[PDB]
Amino acid sequence: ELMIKSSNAFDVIELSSQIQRYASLSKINNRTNPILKDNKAKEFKDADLKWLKLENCPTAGDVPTTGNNNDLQDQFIACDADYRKGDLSYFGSQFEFSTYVHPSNPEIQRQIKQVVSYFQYRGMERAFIGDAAGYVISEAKKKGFSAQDYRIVLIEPDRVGYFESNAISYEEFIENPSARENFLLKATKDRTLALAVSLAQTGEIAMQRDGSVAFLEDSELCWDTAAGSAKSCLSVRYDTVGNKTELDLKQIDVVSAKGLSFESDGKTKTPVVSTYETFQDGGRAKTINAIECPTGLNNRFAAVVSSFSTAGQNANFSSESAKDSQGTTQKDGSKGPHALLSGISLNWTLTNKVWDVTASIGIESGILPTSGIDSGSLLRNPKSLSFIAFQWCEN
Amino acid sequence: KSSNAFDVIELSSQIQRYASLSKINNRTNPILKDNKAKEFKDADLKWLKLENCPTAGDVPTTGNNNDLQDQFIACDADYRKGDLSYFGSQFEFSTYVHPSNPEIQRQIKQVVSYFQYRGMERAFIGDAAGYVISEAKKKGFSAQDYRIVLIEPDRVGYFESNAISYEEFIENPSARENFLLKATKDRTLALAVSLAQTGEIAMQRDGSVAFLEDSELCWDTAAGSAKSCLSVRYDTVGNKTELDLKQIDVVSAKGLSFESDGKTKTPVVSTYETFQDGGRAKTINAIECPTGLNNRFAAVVSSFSTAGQNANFSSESAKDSQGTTQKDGSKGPHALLSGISLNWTLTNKVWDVTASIGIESGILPTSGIDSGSLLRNPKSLSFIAFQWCEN
Amino acid sequence: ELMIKSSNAFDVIELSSQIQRYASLSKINNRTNPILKDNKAKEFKDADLKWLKLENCPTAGDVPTTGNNNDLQDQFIACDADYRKGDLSYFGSQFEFSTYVHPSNPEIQRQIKQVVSYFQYRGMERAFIGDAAGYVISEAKKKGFSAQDYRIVLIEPDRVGYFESNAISYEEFIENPSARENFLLKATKDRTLALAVSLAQTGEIAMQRDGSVAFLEDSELCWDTAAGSAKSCLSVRYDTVGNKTELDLKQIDVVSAKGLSFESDGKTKTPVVSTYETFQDGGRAKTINAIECPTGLNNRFAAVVSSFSTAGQNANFSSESAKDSQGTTQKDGSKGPHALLSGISLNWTLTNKVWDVTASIGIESGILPTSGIDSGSLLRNPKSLSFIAFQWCEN
Amino acid sequence: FNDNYSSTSTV
Amino acid sequence: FNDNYSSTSTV
Amino acid sequence: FNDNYSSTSTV
Ligand SMILES: [Ca+2]
Ligand SMILES: [Ca+2]
Ligand SMILES: [Ca+2]
Ligand SMILES: [Ca+2]
Ligand SMILES: [Ca+2]
Ligand SMILES: [Ca+2]
Ligand SMILES: [Cl-]
Ligand SMILES: [Cl-]
Ligand SMILES: [Cl-]
């Protein structure tokens, strides 16, 4: 019975939906989508559909497996599959690309802009391709596909794959008898008459566990929350002025991360973290443990002056709220007035996960003893100093 | 066409969702605004279309036409087609006092959607019901009181003059023919559709479905478990929501902004700076800001001495300081200090940073980079530069 | 069409889709799918369909309910359902699994790779299984049911379940009489002739609002954006070269948070935020509002010196781009040259959301008046000072 | 610094 | 600091 | 600063 139309259209939508899924994946079974590895602006994939079958099949396809054949293998069509049957017979698919640098997959050189899957019409009368197309649109709606961007085309080989020499919208083919016949008037034997299928997913379509289904533009990913009847959402917006995308988390009160990295001027950084530091008694260098950096980043450090005086060892600067400063050591060992200052140096070296910090305060000469921690014109690793330590990681 | 069974369940499932919501796109559900105990909705389904369509619908959208509007059917939609033809829906309401929405005057008790049979032979309504219910169960729906009925007008809507359960029509041939004998052409034959969603719900591409409270969105990882999921939690005492990413080891962003005390900021990034020879201002390129934020800068003192030009402070681990320039051209000891100024001005994406060290007079030459009582843009200085962006 | 042709095929598809529904769910009625709880690589489910009926049936099935009889119970087939009827008679289902560690559900120990459901043929002539299978495939397309392979098979009892001694694709069985007749010749008395309906669990599986289904390794959660055909995605990656998972947001231009916290050395942190500060005229102490900390974190503060001189009160440092410094006050009240320096102290105490900040610049003695804001050897809360104030929160 | 603080001088 | 800046001295 | 650092003085 001539409901083989509907059944034929079912197969057209089934195959096209799987091509769309494949076209939406950057990785398939933990390996780069092979079609993304090249850099040409167009590619046509053959109608035998080996490029869409798994590599581990009785005949080997082009779609990668993991390597362990006990794992679950994501797949698209069965390996004995063939869609070059029926009145709408699969003729191949036209991929159009733009170049793309993937932030985490150096193997990817392009991104897909559009995929068109062609089904040549082998019906008995060529003017009935319109009727057949009506069934594909119906089957599309049944699987959540828009069914609003269809056209009938004539295709012939190009230097690369094929090109559409002429096209007419499905709506003009059905409603415009003049345009219809003018189109059919071009359907010579050198060209191939075909339905051109570009599927767009309605908002009803389910999100898939491999991620091939993208959220619609301006839609939000939301959670029910114990705020009751409130839902807290995030979304990825694009701003046409400035040409930038934003991950908007501002509807949630706090984003709580563990490790966190970001970029400044192409370089990767961790947020600076700060401590209040003083040297302890005895003129000995200060050891500060280095933060553990994310892999690929390296430790940075900076010390900045908060409080100082020329008392050297005769000081307690360890409280943030008060400073104890008892003056400068004199030649006879007594504590005198505070000498005048000429410089402060803060130095730091990273050796084996430890920042070794040293400091010197330069003061007027002729006051300090000849020997000791405070001697000559230098107060070495003085207590009369407080600094803030900033640590971060960068590349 | 051959999409009739899909359309029957699609339309019925959207009508059921409408009936389960008190609000649609931030406005009260128009059907709830009265208190009549029963109401029938027209078969043309204009009442289910958005108001912002060529013909005005009755379902509210947000007043703003930017973001996505929750909708139930398309505006050109017509479901009064096919062998099972949408005939309208009979809503039953109960009186209900709203705890927080004064516009709602009633609550929904039940919705039944009728699809009129337009086939020439009525005995096939059983098969047609079978494809409808098969599509219902495939979509996670249980049919409620699934029945084949004959309906004729009433005061408000319609009433079921005769009915037979879908199960009796298929399993009891006598009741079937008895019912079928009653189904004359003068009467209207109908499928009565009441759906209850019994299966769980898939996340949808329009974002209309929210994750359940306390659920985790997870990725398979070769790391195993407990490090691959994220979630949105609620604090009941402090009335705060948290996007909990702490199961992931590192959050890796490109641009990053956060809020502090009503202002939006990017993280401070720091550089180690010294002036080179020659006493010129130092140019530091301003970072590129996110849209709507502007450049900020601060320089703070790390190391200094009074050697001025006679210094090299560019190593972080040691400082070379050779004293203050004397007027007789020689280098003497380090003179005593009175001040340090650090100044910065933004001009065409460059921060021009200048510094001065003020020192005791009567030591430096009368002219030059180090002259009078000033060391101009001295080398005997290391400062930390902080940059960030804010609104 | 809304009329049933084959009524056996109608029943086969119903049972077939409900097996499809069951296999795609990790949870049923708020509980783990029973078939995921074991660790065997293969398991065969009986033809009586006990394993598919609800636990609350008069006779107990294996499918869990919510325990609460107030809730709606998700169900697959009715309690009195029996599919061992008709020319194609349900014979059982062969589930094949792979081992699996679920990221958040320890009750799940395996994942389904494929389900093969068997329908033994009981028609008078063995070759008509071709026709009956054809009605199943046709009825499937009419009902929107997508299986991944249809085959005619001979099965024999096993130690565990069954195994397929022989199989032939539905297409070769109807198109190739030689393969067909050779196949039927293997249908000895110990074997069962059957239609094999094959479900393959792929990446198409729907993501559930309860989070019971995980994204595949390295898959991308994507948004359509107004850049047109551009897609903006995020994902959770694992890099074994450092044994760390990464929430990769680098495809999006800006991550925009409200509150933000991260970890450094096991401690929780908020970003450091800075203000440029000077004291008001008159030597009065400085007040700075403490930032709001997330609950469970505490306020921290540090002030670091940016500019200073010994001018005391005779100065204005409030502009970031220029400094006005008019010398040190002399004993007679006049403004003299800038005195020499011996120290700077910066002090800060938190009192009820306010940081009280004081400062002192120590200078050479014998120059200042005996009393006043600038007196002895001290310039108190001086205007001849600019400091950077850093705040952050920590636990 | 408290008010006991004092320094050397150039006077 | 602008060029009017001056200090005390040890000369 | 290394131990060669020295400054002017008020004595
Ligand atoms: Ca570098
Ligand atoms: Ca700007
Ligand atoms: Ca439930
Ligand atoms: Ca096949
Ligand atoms: Ca034979
Ligand atoms: Ca403020
Ligand atoms: Cl103090
Ligand atoms: Cl200035
Ligand atoms: Cl040094």
Numbering used by the authors:
A (entry chain C), C (entry chain B): 29 to 423
B (entry chain A): 33 to 423
D (entry chain I), E (entry chain H), F (entry chain G): 1 to 11
Relevant lines from the article:
We then analyzed the structure of TcpB alone and in complex with the TcpF (1–15) peptide. We used this TcpB structure as an MR search model to determine the TcpB and TcpF (1–15) peptide complex at a resolution of 2.30 Å. A structural model for all six peptides was successfully built, except for residues 12 to 15 on the C terminus due to the disorder of the region. TcpF (1–15) peptides can be recognized by clefts formed by TcpB domain 3, forming a unique hook-like conformation. A unique hook-like conformation, in which the five N-terminal residues of TcpF adopt a type I β turn structure stabilized by pi-pi stacking of the Phe1-Tyr5 pair, was recognized by the TcpB trimer. In forming this rather compact turn structure, the bulky aromatic amino acid pair got embedded in the binding pocket at the bottom of the clefts, with its N terminus firmly docked at β18 and β19 of TcpB via hydrogen bond interactions between the Phe1 amine group (TcpF) and the side chains of Ser373 and Ser388 (TcpB). The electrostatic interaction between Asp3 (TcpF) and Arg408 (TcpB), as well as the stacking interaction between Tyr5 (TcpF) and His366 (TcpB), further strengthened the rigidity of the turn structure. We speculate that the C terminus of TcpF (1–15) may help their NTDs efficiently come into contact to form a symmetrical trimer. With respect to TcpB and CofJ, although both their domain 3 structures adopt a similar H-type lectin-like fold, the length of the β13/β14 loop of TcpB, corresponding to the α4/β16 loop of CofB, is outstandingly short. This difference in the surface-exposed loop in TcpB makes it incapable of accommodating the elongated structure of CofJ T4bP-SS, which may explain the lack of binding between TcpB and CofJ.
